[PDB]
Amino acid sequence: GYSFSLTTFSPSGKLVQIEYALAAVAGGAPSVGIKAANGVVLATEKKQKSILYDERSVHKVEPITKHIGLVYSGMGPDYRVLVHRARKLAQQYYLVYQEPIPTAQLVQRVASVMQEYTQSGGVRPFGVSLLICGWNEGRPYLFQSDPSGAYFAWKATAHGKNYVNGKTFLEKRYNEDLELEDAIHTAILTLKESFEGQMTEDNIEVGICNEAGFRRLTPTEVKDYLAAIA
Template structure:
């Protein structure tokens, strides 16, 4: 996970930004087939650092959990509840026989009750709320940069700019749009 693509999450006063490096290992990749940032519901998004196939499985399960919640309660799942449920699945895989733990860390962001949320979920199933964080390759440089740049009253536009600059801190090679 620490060697995965760098990912950043920043809570702003009026939203949440999640961003990641989208560098392809080959020019033969169809760039539209690889989705590193995914919408789970209309108000919850997710990004990862680590193994792509594990991430895709967790995205599928998270969407299913959100749909099941909606069918029962007729309202969108709160971000905190989705994080808890995804973390439970990840934790179960650490102690079940015949399966390996997920090789992925997640940043899950959401907007509930006019308030932004940002959580990091580790392969162990532990989850933490953050104001801003970085994970993946060179995450220490990213976190140090965020500690210097983050403020509570950050607007969404400034958070996007800060996320790009944070990714630049850990990016190897030329950065493009």
């Protein structure tokens, strides 16, 4: 189809390559991000091909700023290049405006770079779906960006493998007045629903944005939530 070239339109008006990128998305790692009354919780699985893979060596939740946490859909190396760009962009905004980058604005710049990669005839977009949690002016924000350059705001959402079940889960297993603890419980529950196989401190990692600051969970805390609970 009209996918071998990125800079041309199909007769129906679709640029097939970017929905191919979105098909690469949701085939990767499952992950779920929800917005609670106070904070924002992003959870992702850590399950490798073999037990030799020391998973703590490769974090997936990355703090862009002390107030921003970032998770991806599963496209590892593309996520790494994009997260480097996002970190540098956040630094530029932090120094230019002398204020920390807004979550929505940070997602806007990241999606702008994403769109910049959605042109020309000799490059390809990063097939990564990005979940961004942040705190701005006392308000919590959860945003999702996609390789097409578009971005949106979600109270709760999920992407990766078996994402439709996560969507239904956050449809009926959610209310906007969730406390932080119950928010992490909802996140690990939808992770259990979406994932295949059990989890321990090894198999999940979670980042939580609270208005004081963001922090990625230690694996011990990840087991505390996932195991002996739910």
